[PDB]
Amino acid sequence: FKHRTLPHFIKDDYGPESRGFVENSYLAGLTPTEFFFHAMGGREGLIDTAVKTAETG
Amino acid sequence: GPSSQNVTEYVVRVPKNTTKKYNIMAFNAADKVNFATWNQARLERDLSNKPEDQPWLLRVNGKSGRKFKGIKKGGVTENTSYYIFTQCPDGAFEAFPVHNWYNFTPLA
C-alpha cells in the first residue's frame, strides 16, 4: 500500500510484527496478518523452482 | 446608504416575443476597454469560414482602428437559460432571453 503493508496498521510503522516477523509456532497457529506474509514468502520460493528446471536443461 | 437601505419591489414580465434576437458580447476585463473610444463599429460574420453559427468580426474605429474576433460558446441553454433583465420607466422589470454567447478577443 502507500506507506503501509496492510490496512490494519498505521502509516510508516517499522516494528517487527508490522513487517513480517511471525512470532508464533506451527503448533500454536498463526494470526491472519502473519498467514498472509507467510503466503508471500512461499509464493516466491515456489516460482524459483518452476524457472530452474527449464534453464538448467 | 441606500445600497444599504433602498428597499423596493418591482413587477417582472417575460414577453413571448421580441423584435430582435439577444446575444452576449463578452469582453476581456483585463484589457479594460474604453468604450468611449469607440466612435463607430462594424460587425460582420467572420470570413475564414468561407451564418447563424458564424463567428463575429468586430471592427471598431475603422477597419483597423480596432478589431476583435468573437467565437461562439459551446452551449448557452443546455441546462439553464440566460435572461437579460432591464429596468423600465414604470419601474417594472423586463426580461430578455439570451440567444447566444460569443467570446470576443483582441487582435494584433
Binding site: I10, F36, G42, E44, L46, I47 | -
Partner: protein
C-alpha cells in the same frame, strides 16, 4: 449486456441515407423471445436445456428489431413505412439468467425437467458442450500513469488510454514523454530536456507547445497557466523554459496545424487538406473521453495541462511513480463487457452489407426490398463460432485474435465446478520469466485467494477470487453530476486560473469536471447519501487524498469490492436489534438488502481501501487503552473470508507450511465423488 448494452448499440448507429430519389433506414426497438427449436418440418417448440445436451443442439434465442423506411425524392410527398419485428439472428443464452426457461422455478419443477436444483448456472450450451467465459484482466483506463523506462531515450513517461463511454472499437492512447538528460551533445547540454508528445495517427514526435497552439492559446502567458497553477514556484518554471525555445519560431495557429498535419497516415500534397487532416485527428482522436464534439476545446487544454503538470512533479521528486501491478489499477472483463465488444464488430458488418446490396439494386432504379438484404447468418454464426472455439476474433481472423477464453466446464467434482465459474486470468505471456507479474501483491488482501494457484508454467497467472469479493456492474454518472453542480462546484470554463492553487480538483470517472473550496464537508455529505441510498448506488467508490489535494469518483464496471462493517467514534454500528431480527428471515422478510440500506455495512473498493483504517476484530481492537490507533473507520466481519473456494475446505489451514496449502487446493479439484 442484454437489457442495455444491446439496445444502445443499434440505437446509436448512423442511418444509411443512400441514392434522383434517396431512401432512409433506421432501427428503433429490439425484442427477444424464449429459446426455441425449429423442427424438421418448420414447427417451433421451446427447447429445454436437457435436450440441448442430448441432441447436441445450441441454446439460443431469436432476435427481432423495428425498422422504418422513408423515401425522400421531394416528389411533393415524403413516403414513410416501417416493418416491425424483423428477424436478425440468434443470441446464446446463459443458463439461469432472467431470459432462460429456468428462471424463478421451484425445486418441484426443476426436478420435473430432469435438472439439478443445486446446479449453479452461469454457462452456455453450444453444440452440446458446456462453455464458460473466463474473466480477463485489463489495465484501468481514463487515468494518468507515470512510469520510467530505464532503457530508452525517455527519462519519464505518461499514459492515458481513453474510450468514450462504450462507443469506440479502439481506445486511443497518448504519451507525454520527456527526453533524457545525458544526451551527448554540445548544444542541448545547456538548455536541458524537452517535453515531447507522441500523438496517435501521426509518424513523428511533436513538441507540446506546438500541439497547445493548434487549439488556440498562441500566447505564452495563457499556455503557462494551464500547465503551472502557481507562479511563486521558480523550480518548476525553470524546467518548462527550455520547452518554449524550440517552439519559438512557429508562432501561429494555421502554420502549427500544418506542422502536425504534414506527418500523418497520408502526407498532404496540398495545404488545405493538411489543415483539414490535422483538425479532426486533434479533435476526435485526442482524449475522446473528455469530449468529442468540435466545441468545448478548453477542456482538452486543461486535461492536457494536468497531464503535463503531473509529469513535472515526477521529475522534481514531489510525487512517487505509479505501480503497474497495484491491484487498484486493474479492471475485469466479465461476460457482459466481452459479448458487447463482439457484437459491435458484427452489427457494423451487417450494415456494411446492406449498402452493397442496396446500391447494386438501386442503380437499375427498380425499387428496394429489405427483408432480402439482411444476411441473418452474420450474427448467429458469428457469436456461436468464437464462443465454441475460443479465439476472440473472426473466422477468417484465426490469427489476429486473443486465445484462451471460453473453455469447457469442469465436472469432475462439485467443488471443481464452483472453482471454475470464479476464476481470473492475466493476459501476459505464459512463459515470460519476469517475476513481478507473478509474485503476490499486498493489494490482493481479501479479493483474491492467496494460496490457490496452479504450478508449472502458469504460476500466478490464473487466480481465483475470494468468498465475499463482489465485482461491480456499472452505472451512469448522470445523477451525481446534477447533484455536484448544485452543491457549489465551479465549472472549469467560468473560473480564473489563479483561483486554482488552494482548491481541490474534482474528477468524476476520469474527467476533470470542476473545482471546490471546502472538500471535507463535501466528502462526508457524499458519503451519508450513499449510506442510505437516495441518489447514489452502493457500488461507487469515492477517494480523497489529502496531500495531492483532489477527489476522485468512479462509476464504471470492473472494479472489485467487498463488504465491511462501518465504525463510528469507537463502537460498531451493528447493535443487537439487528441480530435478533436477522435470525428470522424465514417469516419476516428482513435480509441482506435491508442491512445495507440501513447504513451498517458498506462495499469498499481497492482504491478506497488506501484511505481507510481497519480493525480485524471488534471485542479486541476497539477497547480504550494505551492503544495502537483510536480512529478506526471500519471493521472486518470474519478474517476467514480471505480464502477461495478450494482452499476453504482445509481444517486448521493456519498450522501448515505455506506451499502445502497450494498443493491441496490444486488437488481437491481431481478427487472422485
Amino acid at each position: 449486456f442484454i437489457q442495455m448494452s444491446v439496445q444502445r448499440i443499434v440505437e446509436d448507429a448512423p442511418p444509411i441515407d443512400l441514392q434522383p430519389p434517396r431512401y432512409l433506414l433506421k432501427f428503433e426497438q429490439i425484442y427477444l423471445s424464449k429459446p426455441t427449436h425449429w423442427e424438421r418440418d418448420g414447427a417451433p417448440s421451446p427447447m429445454m436445456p436437457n435436450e440441448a445436451r442430448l441432441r447436441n443442439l445450441t441454446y439460443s434465442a431469436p432476435l427481432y428489431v423495428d425498422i422504418t423506411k422513408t423515401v425522400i425524392k421531394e416528389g411533393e410527398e415524403q413516403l414513410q413505412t416501417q416493418h416491425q419485428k424483423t428477424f436478425i439472428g440468434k443470441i446464446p443464452i446463459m443458463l439461469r439468467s432472467t431470459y432462460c426457461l429456468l428462471n424463478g422455478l421451484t425445486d418441484r419443477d426443476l426436478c420435473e425437467l430432469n435438472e439439478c436444483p443445486l446446479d449453479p448456472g452461469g454457462y452456455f450450451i453450444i453444440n452440446g458442450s458446456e462453455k464458460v467465459l473466463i474473466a480477463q484482466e485489463k489495465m484501468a483506463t481514463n487515468t494518468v500513469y507515470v512510469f520510467a523506462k530505464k532503457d530508452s531515450k525517455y527519462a519519464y513517461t505518461g499514459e492515458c488510454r481513453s474510450c468514450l463511454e462504450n462507443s469506440s472499437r479502439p481506445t486511443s492512447t497518448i504519451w507525454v514523454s520527456m527526453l533524457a538528460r545525458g544526451g551527448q551533445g554540445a548544444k542541448k547540454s545547456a538548455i536541458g530536456q524537452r517535453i515531447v508528445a507522441t500523438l496517435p495517427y501521426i509518424k513523428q514526435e511533436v513538441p507540446i507547445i506546438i500541439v497547445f497552439r493548434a487549439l488556440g492559446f498562441v500566447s505564452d502567458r495563457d499556455i503557462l497557466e494551464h500547465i503551472i497553477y502557481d507562479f511563486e514556484d521558480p523550480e518548476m518554471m525553470e524546467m518548462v523554459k527550455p520547452s518554449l525555445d524550440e517552439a519559438f519560431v512557429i508562432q501561429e495557429q494555421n502554420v502549427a496545424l500544418n506542422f502536425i498535419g504534414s506527418r500523418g497516415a497520408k502526407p498532404g500534397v496540398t495545404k488545405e487538406k493538411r489543415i483539414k487532416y490535422a483538425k479532426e485527428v486533434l479533435q476526435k482522436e485526442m482524449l475522446p473521453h473528455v469530449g468529442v464534439s468540435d466545441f468545448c476545446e478548453t477542456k482538452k487544454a486543461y486535461f492536457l495541462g494536468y497531464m503535463v503538470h503531473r509529469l513535472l512533479l515526477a521529475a522534481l521528486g514531489r510525487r512517487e511513480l505509479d505501480d503497474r501491478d497495484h491491484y487498484g489499477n486493474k479492471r475485469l472483463d466479465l461476460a457482459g463487457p466481452l459479448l458487447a465488444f463482439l457484437f459491435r464488430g458484427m452489427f457494423k458488418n451487417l450494415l456494411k452489407e446492406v449498402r452493397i446490396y442496396a446500391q447494386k439494386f438501386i442503380d437499375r432504379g427498380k425499387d428496394f426490398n429489405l427483408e432480402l438484404a439482411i444476411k441473418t447468418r452474420i450474427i448467429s454464426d458469428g457469436l456461436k463460432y468464437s464462443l465454441a472455439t475460443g479465439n476472440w476474433g473472426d473466422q477468417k481472423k484465426a490469427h489476429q485474435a486473443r486465445a484462451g477464453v471460453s473453455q469447457v466446464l469442469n465436472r469432475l467434482t462439485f467443488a471443481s465446478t464452483l472453482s471454475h465459474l470464479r476464476r481470473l486470468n492475466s493476459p501476459i505471456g505464459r512463459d515470460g520469466k519476469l517475476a513481478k507479474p507473478r509474485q503476490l501483491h499486498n493489494t490482493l488482501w481479501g479479493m483474491v485467494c492467496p494460496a490457490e494457484t496452479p504450478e508449472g508454467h502458469a504460476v500466478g497467472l490464473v487466480k481465483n477470487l475470494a468468498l465475499m469479493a463482489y465485482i461491480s456492474v456499472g452505472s451512469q454518472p448522470s445523477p451525481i453530476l446534477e447533484f455536484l453542480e448544485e452543491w457549489s462546484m465551479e465549472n472549469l470554463e467560468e473560473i480564473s486560473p489563479a483561483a486554482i492553487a488552494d482548491a481541490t480538483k474534482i474528477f468524476v470517472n476520469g474527467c476533470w469536471v470542476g473545482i471546490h473550496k471546502d472538500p471535507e464537508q463535501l466528502m462526508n455529505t457524499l458519503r451519508k447519501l450513499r449510506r442510505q441510498m437516495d441518489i447514489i448506488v452502493s457500488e461507487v467508490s469515492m477517494i480523497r487524498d489529502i496531500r495531492e489535494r483532489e477527489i476522485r469518483i468512479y462509476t464504471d464496471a470492473g472494479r472489485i469490492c467487498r463488504p465491511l462493517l462501518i465504525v463510528e467514534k469507537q463502537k460498531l454500528l451493528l447493535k443487537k436489534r439487528h441480530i435478533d431480527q436477522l435470525k428470522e428471515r424465514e417469516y419476516n422478510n428482513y435480509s441482506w438488502q435491508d442491512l445495507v440500506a440501513s447504513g451498517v455495512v458498506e462495499y469498499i473498493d481497492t482504491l478506497e481501501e488506501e484511505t481507510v483504517m481497519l480493525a480485524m476484530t471488534p471485542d479486541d481492537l476497539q477497547e480504550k487503552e494505551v492503544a495502537y490507533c483510536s480512529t478506526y473507520t471500519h471493521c472486518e466481519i470474519h478474517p476467514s473470508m480471505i480464502l477461495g473456494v478450494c482452499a476453504s475446505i482445509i481444517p486448521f489451514p493456519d498450522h501448515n507450511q505455506s506451499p502445502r496449502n497450494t498443493y491441496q487446493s490444486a488437488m481437491g479439484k481431481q478427487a472422485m465423488g
